[PDB]
Amino acid sequence: GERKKTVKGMPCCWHCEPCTGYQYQVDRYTCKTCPYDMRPTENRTGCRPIPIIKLEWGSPWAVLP
Numbered sequence: 001g002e003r004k005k006t007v008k009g010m011p012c013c014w015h016c017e018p019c020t021g022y023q024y025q026v027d028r029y030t031c032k033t034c035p036y037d038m039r040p041t042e043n044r045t046g047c048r049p050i051p052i053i054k055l056e057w058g059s060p061w062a063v064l065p
């Protein structure tokens with residue numbers, strides 16, 4: 001769940017830094033950027049649907065109506 005370990009001139013030892021928040025560790029060397037249709041979960045690998053909210057009957061801004 002943490003990509004972009006960039007290899008130096010020698011292809012043996014790498015430095016690992018976090019990718020972007022909206023990006024993924026889908027592959028070892030690819031940040032996937034899962035689309036806006038669904039939000040990253042706790043682990044940065046694998047997409048997860050966004051929770052949905054609606055007009056709640058107990059909404060504080062729906063008392064006077």
Ligand SMILES: CC(C)CCC[C@@H](C)[C@H]1CC[C@H]2[C@@H]3CC=C4C[C@@H](O)CC[C@]4(C)[C@H]3CC[C@]12C
Nearest residue numbers: 053054055056057058059060061062063064065
């Ligand atoms: C007492 C209730 C059930 C009926 C009468 C409600 C009337 C008086 C209206 C007039 C203005 C209204 C408030 C206007 C704005 C807010 C801020 C919001 O973040 C929570 C609800 C709250 C606090 C409303 C509550 C209901 C309210 C006080």
